[PDB]
């Protein structure tokens, strides 16, 4: 990364502290990273954190040359998707095959699959991209997730 | 030169901050290099525009019982008078801490930036309120015992003397010190009693 | 439209019949022939199978549907990070404060702006004036389409 | 992991219904004091939380 | 007040309010932002 | 030492009130151990609109209107030719007395020294709406018979003369002297010139 954007990252680190000495909680790693032009899966991060459970996930600490290498060690990346991948991967609620997507079910997948979203996380991604019957045009729901 | 602007502001800046490191002694305070006027600009600072119609004239709405220089002022010689007669204070040690909101003419065109400096001067809300509102989590507050654990065990460790005085004083309000208000006792919207 | 990417390898080429592509995603995590059942719309499962393969489908969709949920988390965290982006030097300011606490409730510019501050008009107002004109038009437009 | 129980069928019902949109009945059988009375109040204890 | 119109309209240090005294400003944009103020809530409230 | 601050506290006077009005007090503070002067506060600045926003603006800035010869004081000849420059002149005696509402040099400060301090006179307009607005039994008006009968008969009494003068001025409509307007007719942003 250039020193420029890394300075912005130095701040996005610096802000997020606890005892006042260059110390970020493991928890915050992916989220800060996400804002920093990245969407690293919890599974991706968990690899480069060393499999904590909720306890030491909440308790263990990062510092900057643990954070910034992690950022990088995901950032140069492998599979990360595009429109064509995500129209199929968001035709993912087509109910008959309809070019529009299932309202409750888009919420449920988000609770029910891998990286279990809260209710909160589910509703926010979905809401108001359905119609009266609760059909979501995914062809657009795709671009919404893929840019913003 | 422009040191003329700065003699009028060795009068008025000095309004911030040259003797400020008082009982905690002789700090690296406000600098003479002109760019640094904008480090004196820290958060908590609102200054309303010149022909204000009035948030600035509200200072006329109290003007009478404050001023010094009445073609219409409060000079050095008026927080190095008035605060000893209006809001707080100063030892030669804390001299131009508080007197660093006037070491030189608070004209009406500076009353402007003294209720400006009221909602500004000493580390105001974004600093003070948020000192603990950032340790805090949310629509919340901080735990009493944990704040005792702080004050003594975290950083420059303080004495018993210091804790006891700041204990009987601490607004313990439901097992938790009401931090936002321990700071913003000094602020909101319902009093016209002190400082000014 | 869920199991999809258990076989990221099997399905490509844009779009693909529903029903059929499901056999492609389902085979790619073993999902034994006798245990899942296809109608028009409903899928049916035996004791034991559905659900440990739904669970293990969380384990094997990973690849894109975890990388779907990831994009979501991304998009959201952008907006939602907040809570610790702060305290550091202000905590150290609590210490500035505390070394001086003896002299804190003891403060200069406290309350003298605000009791005669219901009685007055002209308020924030110059900040308002320009942006009030902008506010006036906007407020009209938004009410209209509701 | 959610196996043969009045509950088990009741989450089969609770899931399917909402997917398929075909309405659901849970019907006990059998003789006097055979716990229709209860296996009902279990479907009650199931959905209640 | 009624007897004051009959009598007290008469000192030297009370009835000095207009002629050249609306020439001292701090009322212009308020005249507009009184009427606009009423419309401002009439616009906010109905929207929300 | 701890003293040089306190040396300075005396120039307040040298341009505000004191150089006329030791009347309006310099209030002694500053006891040498400078921890002490935190007791000297003026706690509680509120009542109805003391600086009313269409009045005391004008008064003070009518120093820049009433100082005609542009000296910095207000002479007998200032108030006069400046009233002549509007219209209705006081006689030199009426003026002399109106200057003698202060002991002599009515300058920029002595002017406002008597101006603000005088907080009393007539009733407020919103009290004056309450005058007949509290007599009505609903939202309605005031029957004219009742305003005539009262002014003459009840409590403090008028003469016929006193009512008839008030009556040609009194906005009768629908046998109802709709009181709200007559109140504004007597006391709004009222007439100039009569003081200062």
XYZ file of C-alpha atoms in Angstrom:
783
model
C 0.000 0.000 0.000
C 1.203 3.574 -0.581
C 2.209 5.653 2.452
C -0.647 7.994 1.608
C -3.489 5.448 1.946
C -1.510 3.681 4.714
C -1.529 7.017 6.630
C -5.319 6.961 6.309
C -5.135 3.375 7.569
C -2.794 4.544 10.390
C -5.640 6.814 11.502
C -8.348 4.130 11.000
C -6.159 2.117 13.292
C -5.311 4.964 15.719
C -8.866 5.931 16.373
C -9.965 2.435 17.469
C -7.914 1.986 20.701
C -8.413 0.747 24.340
C -5.719 1.442 27.029
C -4.203 4.201 24.888
C -1.153 2.294 23.565
C -1.468 1.252 19.923
C -3.786 -1.640 20.620
C -6.848 -2.662 18.578
C -9.207 -5.536 19.550
C -9.250 -8.575 17.223
C -12.972 -7.977 16.728
C -12.320 -4.619 14.987
C -9.828 -6.024 12.419
C -12.155 -7.026 9.568
C -14.537 -4.089 9.974
C -11.738 -1.506 9.801
C -10.350 -3.535 6.865
C -13.810 -3.521 5.256
C -13.906 0.257 5.206
C -10.357 0.114 3.788
C -11.504 -1.141 0.370
C -11.891 -4.808 1.269
C -14.760 -7.169 2.330
C -12.710 -9.922 4.059
C -14.904 -12.814 5.139
C -14.961 -13.703 8.833
C -13.566 -17.051 7.671
C -10.754 -15.242 5.731
C -9.903 -13.114 8.820
C -10.212 -16.051 11.270
C -7.459 -17.759 9.279
C -5.124 -14.763 9.727
C -6.225 -14.309 13.369
C -5.704 -17.972 14.464
C -9.220 -19.258 15.270
C -10.419 -17.476 18.484
C -13.808 -18.314 19.978
C -16.041 -15.396 21.181
C -14.180 -14.992 24.487
C -10.593 -14.411 23.244
C -12.103 -12.934 20.003
C -13.442 -10.191 22.236
C -10.377 -10.226 24.498
C -7.253 -10.633 22.286
C -5.374 -7.651 20.995
C -3.902 -6.489 17.742
C -1.200 -3.792 17.328
C -0.288 -1.972 14.015
C 2.336 -4.348 12.582
C -0.016 -7.139 13.260
C -2.990 -5.250 11.735
C -1.384 -3.741 8.619
C 0.221 -7.134 7.570
C -3.209 -8.788 8.057
C -4.840 -6.094 5.880
C -2.265 -6.872 3.187
C -2.348 -10.657 3.649
C -6.007 -10.621 2.651
C -5.979 -7.507 0.324
C -3.851 -9.049 -2.434
C -6.670 -11.494 -3.015
C -7.815 -14.665 -4.747
C -11.534 -15.153 -5.592
C -13.540 -11.943 -5.051
C -16.626 -11.617 -7.216
C -18.118 -9.678 -10.100
C -21.630 -9.013 -11.554
C -21.873 -12.254 -13.481
C -20.898 -14.305 -10.389
C -23.338 -12.375 -8.198
C -26.392 -12.427 -10.498
C -26.295 -16.215 -10.291
C -25.262 -15.990 -6.627
C -28.226 -13.601 -6.165
C -30.661 -15.346 -8.504
C -30.285 -17.097 -5.171
C -33.923 -16.234 -4.141
C -35.780 -16.728 -7.458
C -38.697 -18.845 -6.087
C -39.892 -20.036 -9.539
C -37.111 -18.465 -11.597
C -38.569 -15.017 -11.731
C -35.949 -12.247 -12.180
C -37.097 -11.026 -8.751
C -36.318 -12.498 -5.274
C -37.988 -13.877 -2.039
C -38.578 -11.330 0.748
C -38.620 -13.481 3.918
C -36.076 -15.886 2.423
C -33.385 -13.262 1.653
C -33.680 -12.410 5.322
C -33.552 -16.088 6.296
C -30.407 -17.106 4.249
C -28.733 -14.210 5.936
C -29.668 -15.721 9.374
C -29.332 -19.377 8.279
C -26.110 -19.575 6.249
C -22.397 -19.651 7.150
C -21.762 -16.187 8.363
C -24.921 -15.822 10.355
C -26.254 -12.325 10.180
C -28.313 -10.876 12.928
C -31.822 -9.856 12.136
C -30.262 -6.317 12.111
C -27.682 -7.189 9.438
C -30.261 -9.114 7.389
C -32.923 -6.387 7.370
C -30.532 -3.597 6.449
C -29.157 -5.305 3.327
C -32.576 -6.274 2.085
C -35.217 -3.667 3.046
C -37.091 -1.734 0.372
C -35.625 -3.573 -2.595
C -38.753 -5.689 -2.675
C -42.172 -4.698 -4.032
C -45.819 -5.103 -2.771
C -45.649 -8.884 -2.922
C -42.059 -8.828 -1.680
C -40.241 -9.689 -4.868
C -36.696 -8.133 -5.039
C -35.109 -7.454 -8.527
C -31.866 -9.183 -7.841
C -30.251 -7.957 -11.133
C -30.112 -4.709 -9.239
C -29.733 -6.044 -5.653
C -26.465 -7.437 -7.089
C -25.012 -4.067 -8.112
C -26.123 -2.586 -4.821
C -24.057 -5.173 -2.911
C -21.168 -4.981 -5.421
C -20.636 -1.191 -5.306
C -21.156 0.968 -2.174
C 5.610 42.805 11.380
C 2.114 41.265 11.381
C 3.454 40.956 14.878
C 1.328 44.168 14.907
C -1.730 41.962 14.333
C 0.169 39.903 16.966
C 0.772 42.914 19.347
C -2.946 43.623 19.122
C -2.922 39.862 19.636
C -0.165 39.758 22.236
C -3.016 41.455 23.643
C -5.687 39.172 21.997
C -3.533 35.916 21.625
C -2.408 35.515 24.485
C -6.309 35.217 24.339
C -5.068 31.608 24.221
C -2.907 30.761 26.079
C 0.546 31.629 27.279
C 0.611 31.035 31.075
C -2.012 28.248 30.970
C 0.091 25.468 32.567
C -0.752 26.519 36.090
C -0.820 24.098 39.050
C 0.221 21.422 36.618
C 3.298 23.593 35.874
C 4.841 25.388 32.926
C 3.584 23.401 29.954
C 4.503 23.680 26.226
C 1.596 26.203 25.828
C 0.361 28.357 22.859
C 3.156 29.308 20.352
C 4.216 32.634 18.838
C 4.573 31.121 15.245
C 1.451 32.453 13.400
C 0.193 29.183 11.753
C -0.415 27.703 15.188
C -3.408 30.017 15.759
C -5.068 27.011 14.104
C -4.050 24.539 16.790
C -5.579 26.870 19.260
C -8.396 25.987 16.873
C -9.354 22.719 18.326
C -12.844 21.250 18.380
C -15.503 22.775 20.500
C -15.429 26.142 18.673
C -18.468 27.993 17.110
C -18.152 31.606 15.959
C -21.167 33.306 14.426
C -20.752 35.761 11.524
C -20.149 39.536 11.798
C -23.478 41.277 10.905
C -25.053 38.448 12.842
C -28.532 39.972 13.182
C -28.101 38.023 16.547
C -26.462 35.167 17.977
C -23.601 37.661 18.381
C -25.797 40.535 19.665
C -27.070 38.244 22.529
C -23.829 39.396 24.145
C -25.277 42.949 24.052
C -28.384 41.403 25.670
C -26.225 40.893 28.727
C -23.443 43.453 27.879
C -24.172 45.980 30.555
C -23.134 44.063 33.639
C -19.848 42.690 32.146
C -17.857 45.162 30.109
C -14.801 47.361 30.523
C -14.168 49.704 27.791
C -17.446 51.149 26.997
C -17.027 52.268 23.641
C -17.674 48.640 24.311
C -15.050 46.122 25.462
C -13.356 43.821 28.064
C -9.471 44.289 27.634
C -6.390 42.438 29.160
C -7.172 44.743 32.020
C -10.674 43.249 31.935
C -10.165 39.504 32.283
C -7.068 40.638 34.093
C -10.060 42.260 35.599
C -13.636 40.824 34.829
C -13.301 37.047 35.590
C -12.338 37.863 39.146
C -15.710 39.648 38.990
C -17.729 37.311 36.603
C -16.680 33.658 35.861
C -13.407 32.023 37.276
C -9.764 32.504 37.866
C -6.082 32.609 38.056
C -2.968 32.505 40.083
C 0.187 33.966 38.161
C 0.520 30.267 37.711
C -3.025 29.916 36.143
C -2.784 33.580 35.095
C -3.477 33.604 31.434
C -5.198 30.298 31.527
C -8.518 31.980 32.209
C -6.999 35.419 31.656
C -6.028 33.905 28.282
C -9.591 34.585 27.232
C -8.692 38.220 27.412
C -5.100 39.464 27.450
C -6.353 42.196 25.122
C -9.626 43.867 23.958
C -12.748 41.821 23.893
C -14.369 44.516 21.732
C -18.083 43.763 20.890
C -16.248 42.537 17.799
C -14.610 39.985 20.143
C -17.649 39.453 22.453
C -18.444 37.703 19.228
C -15.516 35.429 19.947
C -15.842 35.277 23.722
C -19.187 33.645 23.833
C -17.450 32.232 20.801
C -14.566 31.470 23.264
C -17.254 30.274 25.794
C -18.298 27.677 23.226
C -14.728 26.991 22.382
C -11.923 28.026 24.853
C -11.063 25.376 27.474
C -11.233 21.773 25.969
C -14.954 21.996 25.160
C -17.493 19.172 24.574
C -15.680 17.198 21.786
C -12.836 16.942 24.254
C -14.369 17.130 27.802
C -17.724 15.340 27.239
C -16.075 12.781 25.013
C -13.132 12.077 27.401
C -15.343 9.392 28.931
C -18.196 9.363 26.333
C -15.645 7.595 24.134
C -14.659 5.012 26.816
C -18.402 4.525 27.038
C -20.193 2.159 24.728
C -23.496 3.757 23.568
C -26.614 5.358 25.206
C -24.603 4.763 28.334
C -22.242 5.790 31.127
C -19.200 4.320 32.967
C -19.020 2.084 36.050
C -18.017 3.637 39.370
C -15.594 0.914 40.575
C -13.985 0.745 37.148
C -13.471 4.512 37.243
C -11.845 4.222 40.706
C -9.632 1.488 39.180
C -8.705 3.974 36.424
C -7.861 7.093 38.353
C -5.372 5.314 40.536
C -4.104 2.402 38.366
C -4.089 3.995 34.843
C -1.282 6.235 33.764
C 0.138 8.950 36.004
C -1.142 7.278 39.193
C -2.972 9.591 41.626
C -3.064 9.666 45.466
C -5.701 8.721 48.063
C -6.122 12.484 48.631
C -6.916 12.926 44.994
C -9.424 10.029 44.876
C -11.367 10.967 48.073
C -11.809 14.571 46.988
C -12.920 13.407 43.515
C -15.075 10.675 45.096
C -17.346 12.745 47.348
C -17.577 15.007 44.345
C -18.179 12.362 41.644
C -21.857 12.390 40.372
C -22.481 8.744 41.170
C -25.795 8.202 39.614
C -26.868 4.585 39.491
C -23.556 2.748 40.212
C -21.981 4.842 37.503
C -20.490 8.269 37.297
C -22.571 10.518 34.986
C -19.589 11.414 32.928
C -21.312 13.398 30.134
C -22.753 15.581 32.887
C -19.566 15.661 35.130
C -18.128 17.560 32.182
C -21.245 19.296 30.693
C -22.312 20.663 34.088
C -20.372 23.503 32.436
C -22.687 23.833 29.279
C -26.278 23.262 28.036
C -29.424 25.514 27.659
C -31.178 26.815 30.799
C -28.861 28.987 32.908
C -27.418 32.533 32.698
C -25.454 32.404 35.993
C -21.621 32.159 35.530
C -19.120 32.632 32.732
C -19.767 35.005 30.534
C -31.030 -20.460 -5.113
C -29.074 -20.941 -1.844
C -27.030 -24.140 -2.310
C -25.715 -22.622 -5.581
C -22.108 -22.345 -4.913
C -21.358 -25.578 -3.035
C -20.293 -26.139 -6.588
C -18.805 -22.813 -7.751
C -16.985 -25.179 -10.053
C -20.032 -26.903 -11.541
C -22.194 -23.919 -12.516
C -20.873 -21.155 -14.797
C -22.049 -19.156 -17.883
C -24.261 -16.450 -16.483
C -27.635 -17.914 -15.619
C -28.860 -21.515 -15.471
C -32.164 -23.377 -14.914
C -33.103 -23.532 -11.272
C -34.070 -27.088 -10.593
C -31.199 -28.658 -12.534
C -28.379 -26.461 -11.218
C -29.563 -27.458 -7.767
C -28.607 -31.083 -8.528
C -25.204 -29.668 -9.535
C -24.726 -27.734 -6.261
C -26.233 -30.567 -4.150
C -23.990 -33.331 -5.500
C -20.917 -31.253 -4.709
C -21.408 -31.769 -0.949
C -22.303 -35.473 -1.159
C -26.112 -34.963 -0.452
C -27.052 -38.545 -0.999
C -29.723 -39.415 -3.638
C -32.182 -41.050 -1.191
C -32.326 -38.185 1.322
C -33.379 -34.939 -0.420
C -36.564 -34.668 -2.540
C -37.429 -32.454 -5.421
C -40.906 -31.326 -6.447
C -41.751 -28.254 -8.472
C -40.958 -25.796 -5.719
C -40.453 -27.785 -2.429
C -37.433 -29.826 -1.336
C -37.979 -32.544 1.227
C -35.487 -34.280 3.495
C -35.221 -37.380 5.559
C -34.244 -37.478 9.290
C -30.601 -36.408 9.912
C -29.740 -35.196 6.374
C -31.265 -31.737 5.480
C -29.893 -29.953 8.161
C -26.437 -31.279 8.819
C -25.966 -30.702 5.122
C -27.552 -27.206 5.554
C -25.055 -26.753 8.383
C -22.251 -28.330 6.400
C -23.547 -26.321 3.415
C -22.618 -23.317 5.667
C -19.251 -25.013 5.830
C -19.220 -25.592 2.008
C -20.813 -22.219 1.016
C -18.125 -20.669 2.242
C -16.838 -19.887 -1.315
C -19.478 -17.537 -2.841
C -22.453 -17.378 -0.297
C -20.150 -16.653 2.626
C -18.417 -14.259 0.105
C -21.973 -12.938 -0.461
C -22.635 -12.342 3.255
C -19.098 -10.839 3.331
C -19.924 -8.156 0.776
C -22.962 -7.341 2.933
C -20.841 -7.060 6.113
C -18.502 -4.899 4.077
C -21.197 -2.536 2.742
C -22.621 -2.261 6.255
C -19.375 -1.895 8.294
C -18.501 1.075 6.073
C -21.449 2.806 7.679
C -21.511 1.043 11.065
C -17.924 0.858 12.480
C -18.256 3.721 15.036
C -17.973 2.471 18.630
C -14.145 2.497 19.400
C -13.057 5.074 16.708
C -12.179 7.537 19.410
C -11.127 7.349 23.005
C -7.365 7.423 22.955
C -5.997 10.885 23.687
C -9.326 11.941 25.296
C -8.751 9.227 27.916
C -5.341 10.797 28.380
C -7.268 14.094 28.613
C -9.256 12.532 31.569
C -5.793 12.321 33.096
C -5.091 16.013 32.226
C -8.417 16.680 33.861
C -7.720 14.459 36.870
C -4.312 15.972 37.754
C -6.304 19.165 37.798
C -9.692 17.684 39.161
C -9.117 19.492 42.461
C -9.587 22.488 40.169
C -12.218 21.047 37.690
C -15.689 21.621 39.226
C -14.297 25.103 39.539
C -15.016 26.423 36.056
C -14.886 29.739 34.389
C -17.231 29.768 31.364
C -20.056 27.641 32.750
C -23.670 28.673 32.364
C -24.090 32.413 31.404
C -25.398 31.995 27.837
C -28.650 30.156 28.225
C -31.526 31.352 30.531
C -32.302 34.454 28.475
C -31.943 32.236 25.417
C -35.616 31.274 24.991
C -36.421 35.003 24.754
C -34.409 35.786 21.614
C -34.739 35.486 17.880
C -31.827 35.519 15.463
C -30.340 32.239 16.683
C -28.016 30.040 14.450
C -29.552 31.842 11.570
C -26.725 32.990 9.306
C -25.701 29.378 9.108
C -29.468 29.077 8.575
C -30.065 31.926 5.983
C -28.173 30.445 3.004
C -28.975 26.875 3.941
C -32.519 27.883 4.962
C -33.242 28.826 1.362
C -31.855 25.423 0.349
C -33.954 23.816 3.118
C -37.170 25.563 1.975
C -37.239 24.068 -1.510
C -36.151 20.559 -0.491
C -38.824 20.326 2.230
C -41.453 21.107 -0.405
C -40.242 18.397 -2.868
C -40.112 15.636 -0.255
C -43.611 16.227 1.081
C -44.968 16.252 -2.483
C -44.041 12.674 -3.444
C -45.353 11.397 -0.097
C -30.342 -32.334 15.287
C -34.026 -31.444 15.615
C -35.423 -35.062 15.681
C -38.747 -37.121 16.277
C -40.842 -35.040 18.559
C -44.007 -32.971 18.384
C -41.518 -30.105 18.171
C -39.590 -31.744 15.276
C -42.626 -31.902 13.069
C -43.632 -28.414 14.408
C -40.378 -26.806 13.005
C -40.855 -28.831 9.827
C -44.262 -27.216 9.716
C -42.839 -23.823 10.771
C -40.182 -23.925 8.093
C -42.104 -25.501 5.186
C -45.306 -23.446 5.537
C -43.406 -20.231 5.228
C -41.492 -21.488 2.208
C -44.227 -23.460 0.359
C -47.264 -21.457 1.442
C -49.411 -24.439 2.191
C -51.078 -24.267 5.616
C -50.340 -26.696 8.410
C -52.176 -28.967 10.791
C -50.785 -31.100 13.669
C -53.208 -33.774 14.716
C -52.874 -36.248 17.577
C -54.509 -39.639 17.467
C -55.345 -42.496 19.785
C -57.256 -43.285 22.872
C -58.263 -41.912 26.266
C -55.655 -39.855 27.981
C -53.250 -40.461 25.106
C -51.744 -36.951 25.417
C -53.375 -35.026 22.679
C -54.025 -32.621 25.495
C -50.266 -32.388 26.085
C -48.580 -32.853 22.651
C -50.732 -29.880 21.665
C -49.451 -27.755 24.587
C -45.990 -28.732 23.438
C -46.681 -27.249 19.969
C -47.773 -24.343 22.152
C -44.475 -24.550 24.188
C -42.554 -24.840 20.912
C -43.672 -21.771 19.005
C -43.960 -19.597 22.168
C -40.225 -19.195 22.075
C -52.761 52.199 29.736
C -56.081 53.767 28.777
C -55.515 56.720 31.178
C -51.868 56.656 30.036
C -53.027 57.486 26.488
C -55.071 60.238 28.108
C -52.158 61.342 30.336
C -48.869 59.303 30.429
C -48.063 59.742 26.646
C -45.974 62.558 28.154
C -42.499 62.577 29.731
C -39.103 63.122 28.156
C -37.572 59.642 28.551
C -40.011 57.051 27.278
C -41.558 57.701 23.802
C -38.505 57.198 21.574
C -39.013 54.073 19.552
C -39.401 54.650 15.770
C -38.644 57.385 13.184
C -34.873 56.863 12.657
C -34.683 53.863 14.904
C -35.740 51.042 12.443
C -32.674 52.231 10.490
C -30.674 50.333 13.152
C -30.927 46.935 11.605
C -31.128 43.417 13.264
C -34.557 42.676 11.950
C -34.387 42.133 8.107
C -33.980 38.439 7.385
C -36.097 37.835 10.559
C -39.124 39.409 8.856
C -38.703 36.844 6.090
C -37.593 34.048 8.587
C -40.673 34.669 10.716
C -43.001 33.949 7.774
C -40.641 31.370 6.390
C -40.236 29.939 9.953
C -43.966 29.198 10.039
C -43.695 27.558 6.610
C -40.537 25.806 7.931
C -42.433 23.774 10.482
C -45.444 23.608 8.081
C -42.989 21.904 5.710
C -41.054 19.731 8.231
C -44.072 18.397 10.177
C -46.240 17.433 7.183
C -43.352 15.605 5.564
C -42.278 13.564 8.673
C 4.490 37.372 42.888
C 0.958 36.198 42.228
C 0.492 39.978 42.194
C 0.984 41.351 38.664
C -2.376 40.014 37.631
C -3.908 41.965 40.509
C -2.044 45.182 39.575
C -3.848 45.137 36.266
C -7.435 44.752 37.629
C -7.933 48.552 37.810
C -8.178 49.670 34.108
C -11.833 48.461 33.875
C -12.812 51.832 35.220
C -10.676 53.867 32.834
C -13.224 53.386 30.141
C -16.522 52.038 31.595
C -18.985 53.303 34.088
C -16.935 54.491 36.967
C -15.534 57.634 35.310
C -19.028 58.883 35.632
C -20.631 56.399 37.976
C -18.830 55.120 40.933
C -22.609 54.763 41.401
C -22.396 51.564 39.272
C -19.777 49.772 41.407
C -16.368 48.424 40.849
C -16.766 45.370 43.090
C -13.527 44.477 45.006
C -12.275 40.884 44.411
C -8.772 39.324 44.130
C -7.573 38.384 47.736
C -3.840 37.769 47.274
C -3.751 33.889 47.591
C -5.438 33.622 44.181
C -7.281 30.393 44.958
C -9.722 32.694 46.715
C -11.413 34.783 43.980
C -13.656 31.846 42.842
C -16.310 33.102 45.258
C -17.030 36.229 43.240
C -19.776 35.315 40.806
C -22.871 37.142 39.554
C -25.253 34.166 39.567
C -28.615 34.435 37.702
C -29.071 36.809 34.737
C -32.817 36.344 33.697
C -36.133 38.192 33.605
C -38.424 39.333 30.690
C -36.605 40.849 27.692
C -34.224 43.304 29.316
C -32.448 44.002 26.074
C -35.544 43.797 23.960
C -34.422 43.172 20.437
C -36.338 46.019 18.936
C -35.355 48.749 21.350
C -31.976 48.590 23.147
C -30.151 47.903 19.841
C -31.267 51.197 18.653
C -30.714 53.152 21.850
C -26.996 52.418 21.996
C -26.583 52.903 18.284
C -28.546 56.099 18.665
C -25.433 57.159 20.530
C -24.047 57.091 16.970
C -27.279 58.787 16.012
C -27.582 61.256 19.008
C -23.943 62.372 19.230
C -24.335 64.987 16.499
C -21.091 66.982 16.762
C -19.236 63.659 17.052
C -17.255 64.449 20.136
C -17.997 61.344 22.225
C -20.295 62.911 24.823
C -23.889 64.199 24.516
C -24.362 67.837 24.937
C -27.483 69.899 25.427
C -26.964 70.820 21.795
C -26.623 67.167 20.789
C -30.076 66.041 21.962
C -31.687 69.183 20.588
C -30.392 69.502 16.993
C -30.591 65.743 16.599
C -34.267 65.898 17.652
C -34.670 68.902 15.284
C -33.095 66.660 12.605
C -36.071 64.353 13.111
C -38.709 66.840 14.229
C -40.234 67.592 17.637
C -37.983 69.679 19.780
C -37.907 69.886 23.554
C -37.332 73.376 25.056
C -33.846 73.934 26.483
C -35.355 73.564 29.990
C -37.001 70.215 29.122
C -33.678 69.191 27.615
C -31.775 70.542 30.626
C -33.756 68.348 32.971
C -33.480 65.394 30.591
C -29.678 65.848 30.757
C -29.984 66.291 34.543
C -31.422 62.809 34.747
C -27.668 62.248 35.025
C -25.005 64.321 36.895
C -23.577 66.150 33.848
C -21.295 64.374 31.244
C -23.805 62.076 29.516
C -21.283 60.378 27.315
C -21.404 56.913 25.676
C -21.363 55.213 29.096
C -23.483 57.587 31.360
C -26.113 57.384 28.624
C -26.459 53.632 28.950
C -25.724 53.815 32.702
C -29.188 55.436 33.145
C -30.735 53.638 30.170
C -30.418 50.006 31.377
C -30.771 50.581 35.149
C -34.235 52.099 34.626
C -36.070 48.754 34.292
C -39.531 50.049 35.239
C -42.376 51.935 33.588
C -45.529 50.812 31.784
C -46.883 47.241 31.547
C -45.745 44.727 28.869
C -47.934 44.312 25.728
C -48.670 40.623 26.440
C -49.899 41.700 29.883
C -51.879 44.413 28.070
C -53.487 41.683 25.842
C -54.398 39.858 29.102
C -56.120 43.081 30.166
C -59.265 42.369 28.160
C -58.317 38.866 26.938
C -58.906 37.660 30.516
C -62.456 39.175 30.592
C -63.827 37.240 27.578
C -65.704 34.019 28.447
C -64.578 32.021 25.384
C -62.586 32.712 22.314
C -64.701 35.714 21.221
C -64.391 39.498 21.735
C -65.592 42.087 24.280
C -69.110 43.537 24.185
C -68.817 47.251 23.916
C -71.476 47.870 26.582
C -69.160 46.105 29.033
C -66.090 48.203 28.156
C -68.017 51.470 28.401
C -69.818 50.494 31.627
C -66.582 49.286 33.237
C -64.229 52.216 32.407
C -66.584 54.657 34.002
C -68.124 52.626 36.863
C -65.552 50.120 38.033
C -62.556 50.541 40.397
C -60.481 53.439 39.154
C -62.853 55.620 37.200
C -62.582 57.789 34.146
C -64.413 61.016 33.322
C -66.723 61.253 30.280
C -63.889 63.158 28.595
C -61.509 60.328 29.428
C -63.753 57.720 27.751
C -64.695 59.785 24.605
C -61.030 60.472 23.763
C -60.369 56.751 24.209
C -63.569 56.033 22.234
C -62.841 57.848 18.939
C -59.547 55.944 19.055
C -61.313 52.688 19.987
C -61.820 50.158 17.086
C -65.489 49.270 17.475
C -66.790 46.533 15.161
C -69.936 44.352 15.502
C -70.779 46.052 18.817
C -67.506 44.575 20.005
C -64.369 46.398 20.771
C -61.994 43.703 19.597
C -59.433 44.420 22.192
C -56.296 42.782 20.725
C -55.920 45.519 18.111
C -56.428 48.547 20.430
C -53.627 47.127 22.621
C -51.215 47.114 19.695
C -52.570 50.591 18.731
C -51.348 52.025 22.032
C -47.901 50.379 22.550
C -46.049 48.520 19.673
C -42.678 49.795 18.126
C -44.090 53.139 19.300
C -43.371 56.793 18.507
C -40.065 58.682 18.415
C -39.021 61.336 19.839
C -39.167 61.508 23.616
C -36.048 60.028 25.288
C -33.100 59.892 25.026
